[PDB]
C-alpha cells in the first residue's frame, strides 16, 4: 500500500493496484476488485468519526463517583 | 509591659481546619474541570 | 518570640526594619523580658559566632534531602 504515495500517482507507472488488503483462504495478497468485497463509505465515515468522539469522552473522565442503591 | 496573650482555647482552627481539607477535596475536583483544558467526571 | 511575649508579628518586622536597615547596628531584636529597650547589646544577649554559624548551616543542609523526597518504600521491620 506504500507504492500509492511513494511513487507519484499523477505519473501512473502502475506498481499500485490500490486496495489489496486481505485474503481469507490462501493467505496471499489479492485485490478487492478480483475478490469482490466492498463496503459503503458510511461503514467508516460517521462510524469511526462517531466512535472516536465517543471514546475521547472516556479520557476526559477524571474522578469516579458510585452511589449504591439504598 | 508584656501582658498581651489573649489566647484561652489553643485550637481555634481545629474546627475550621478539617473542614477546609474536606472543602479542598471538593475544590481540587473543579481545578481539573476548569477551563477548556480541563477534564470531565462520571457519577 | 513575639508569640510568647505577645508582640505583633507585623510590628515585629517593621520595628527591626526601621532600625537594623538605616542604622548599621543589627542588635535590634524582640525583647521577651519586658524591658524598655530592644537593643541586645545593652540587654547582654550573646551567642557565639562559629556556634550560631553551624546552627544556620546545618539547618540549611537538612533541606538538601527532604525537599527531594518523592517515593518512599518501607520494608517490614
Swiss-Prot record, chain A:
Species lineage: Eukaryota, Fungi, Dikarya, Ascomycota, Saccharomycotina
Subunit structure, interactors included: Heterooligomeric complex of about 850 to 900 kDa that forms two stacked rings, 12 to 16 nm in diameter.
Compartment(s) where it occurs, according to its Swiss-Prot or TrEMBL record: Cytoplasm
Protein's name according to its UniProt entry: T-complex protein 1 subunit alpha
Species of the source: Saccharomyces cerevisiae (strain ATCC 204508 / S288c)
Name of encoding gene: TCP1
Annotated family: Belongs to the TCP-1 chaperonin family.
Role, per record: Molecular chaperone; assists the folding of proteins upon ATP hydrolysis. Known to play a role, in vitro, in the folding of actin and tubulin. In yeast may play a role in mitotic spindle formation.
From Swiss-Prot, chain B:
Domain of life of the native organism: Eukaryota
Name by which UniProt lists this protein: T-complex protein 1 subunit delta
Transmembrane segments: none
More info: Present with 5530 molecules/cell in log phase SD medium.
Primary gene name: CCT4
Cellular location(s): Cytoplasm
UniProt lineage: Eukaryota, Fungi, Dikarya, Ascomycota, Saccharomycotina
The protein's role, per its UniProt record: Molecular chaperone; assists the folding of proteins upon ATP hydrolysis. Known to play a role, in vitro, in the folding of actin and tubulin. In yeast may play a role in mitotic spindle formation.
Quaternary organization: Heterooligomeric complex of about 850 to 900 kDa that forms two stacked rings, 12 to 16 nm in diameter.
Signal peptide (from-to): none
Protein family (similarity comment): Belongs to the TCP-1 chaperonin family.
From Swiss-Prot, chain C:
Subcellular location: Cytoplasm
Cystine bridges: none
Superkingdom in the source lineage: Eukaryota
Subunit and interaction comment: Heterooligomeric complex of about 850 to 900 kDa that forms two stacked rings, 12 to 16 nm in diameter.
Functional summary from the UniProt entry: Molecular chaperone; assists the folding of proteins upon ATP hydrolysis. Known to play a role, in vitro, in the folding of actin and tubulin. In yeast may play a role in mitotic spindle formation.
Family, as annotated: Belongs to the TCP-1 chaperonin family.
Protein name: T-complex protein 1 subunit epsilon
Protein source organism: Saccharomyces cerevisiae (strain ATCC 204508 / S288c) (Baker's yeast)
